Design a protein around this ligand. Structure first.
Ligand SMILES: *[C@H](O)[C@H](C[C@@H]1CCNC1=O)NC(=O)[C@H](CC(C)C)NC(=O)OCc1ccccc1
Ligand code: NA
Lengths: 305, 307
């Protein structure tokens, strides 16, 4: 009586991981075709990180100042540029393991797999969610920057996250693969805090549908609600409002169970207002919010890549 | 670190080295996954069963009636010709005429209850997902496996060497899963027959709960600490009363690094766990969980919190 997080197979991403070093600063890069993508703070000394002028620091760097290694094999850098908070290093070798890929910018609440890497070497894989406050939970240690998050769709890898930093609460923050941070964070060693977080309503609904599919349906009630009335109530419980897109991505689970989305919204509303009354759902006394509607189908359907 | 006080996530090994070994094996209308290492494909022997054979198979009888050509092995789009076959316990070994160039350095190992491993769930020879499991004390695992998942494997990685420890065979009526080592020997008292089977009463992996309590402290949550003290024997008396596994001195030793890192002696953490068992959590959570989590080993915790 449970439902477990499942990461994507990581092999396609493992074949793209390299290490990038400047001075004594080493982090990970992503090698796709003849370009390596990595966090721009690789060009900083530890002291530079306190208050960096990245345009000025990059002016002082030449191609030959960058050590890019696939394992211990050096890839010669033949060009460099900065795009927002990422550095793009052109190399003289096209990665033969490049998968079909896209760069995407994900929404809060969307999940992805992280391939945590150190010195260009993959160490572990785990599933996480972009929190509404634009942080993520999970393990990142010294040397993990440049590790990426991704989804797979058929045979195409959609990269959505590159790791840059850890906040005081221990959660993590980063950019998309165009170097734009998720959230209001900056890549400098300055006082930064994660904002107040909220619960990912669309994902809770997905998980309630997973419960129904598995025969755990005591919480279905006889009410319905409008989306607007539900969104106003949800925010009082520190739950995210639903978008029109959220309603639509729940479509398949609603169809499979025959439970209208707004009826499930009314059932969630009563759980928020009344509590769980000593009961569990899928073995949990807590409402789980890090499975998307897609995660529920992917796991109940056996999708491969 | 591992992500702060709000949760502790399972982390699997990267699956690429195993992905390169997965193939599809078909016999009749029975299809599952195989593991292709050098010139041998390993897979569950019930691939040779019709749906009807599975209800009560005599495997030696079924296998003697099969020829190499009854086995269709596919690596991606390429058929692999089977040139020999043999059975080892509940695993079939298909010799093929092609060596897998992606064979990693590997070993076959049999894991102990309480130990964790990564599962690469596959369907039709294609990787679908990765997650971490523990071998329960009753020798089941809480996996996610559907029809067609058999032959998916569990593994750990050390350096560049893949230690395969599990191959998937079946789902029990309670929804937990059962399988074999790569020598085809089941974990637990189960058989590869489609008949209802119950596991022994499960117990909680005490050393793992303690490791996870240390992870909570590392991530700044100490609310459950006390300073009762306990002897190891007295802790085990309470643990056994609550259907927890005994803690050995050998477990106490393996907790040493986490105890040193946090400044909490192992027996002091035992005293805190004893109070949690006797008093419950009273509606509080630890690392985001309303239950005591027992599927992280001391090694898993150190791996995620410090390296
Ligand atoms: C092998 O692919 C399959 C994996 C099971 C099937 C459903 N979830 C799993 O983990 N195992 C079997 O088909 C197995 C074969 C016997 C000869 C051991 N039979 C089995 O597991 O029966 C239980 C079952 C439950 C739900 C659906 C189908 C079978
Ligand atoms: Na946290």
């Amino acid at each position: 009586s449970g439902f477990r997080k499942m990461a994507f197979p990581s092999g396609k991403v493992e074949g793209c991981m390299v290490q990038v070093t400047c001075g004594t600063t080493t982090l990970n890069g992503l090698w796709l075709d003849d370009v390596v993508y990595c966090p721009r703070h690789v060009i900083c000394t530890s002291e530079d990180m306190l208050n960096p002028n990245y345009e000025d620091l990059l002016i002082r760097k030449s191609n030959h100042n960058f050590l890019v290694q696939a394992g211990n094999v050096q890839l010669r850098v033949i060009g460099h540029s900065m795009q927002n908070c990422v550095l793009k290093l052109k190399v003289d070798t096209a990665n033969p393991k490049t998968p079909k890929y896209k760069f995407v910018r994900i929404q809060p609440g969307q999940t992805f797999s992280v391939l945590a890497c150190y010195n260009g070497s993959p160490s572990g894989v785990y599933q996480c969610a972009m929190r509404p406050n634009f942080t993520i939970k999970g393990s990142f240690l010294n040397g993990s920057c440049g590790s990426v998050g991704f989804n797979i769709d058929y045979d195409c890898v959609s990269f959505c996250y590159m790791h840059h930093m850890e906040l005081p609460t221990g959660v993590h923050a980063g950019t998309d693969l165009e170097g734009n941070f998720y959230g209001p964070f900056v890549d400098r060693q300055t006082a930064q805090a994660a904002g107040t977080d909220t619960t990912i309503t669309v994902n809770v609904l997905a998980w309630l549908y997973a419960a129904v599919i598995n025969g755990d349906r005591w919480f279905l009630n006889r009410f319905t609600t409008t989306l607007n009335d539900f969104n106003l109530v949800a925010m009082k419980y520190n739950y995210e409002p639903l978008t029109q897109d959220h309603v639509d991505i729940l479509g398949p689970l609603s169809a499979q169970t025959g439970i209208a989305v707004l009826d499930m919204c009314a059932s969630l509303k009563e759980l928020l207002q009344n509590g769980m009354n000593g009961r569990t759902i899928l073995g949990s006394a807590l409402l789980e919010d890090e499975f998307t509607p897609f995660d529920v189908v992917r796991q109940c359907s056996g999708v491969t890549f």
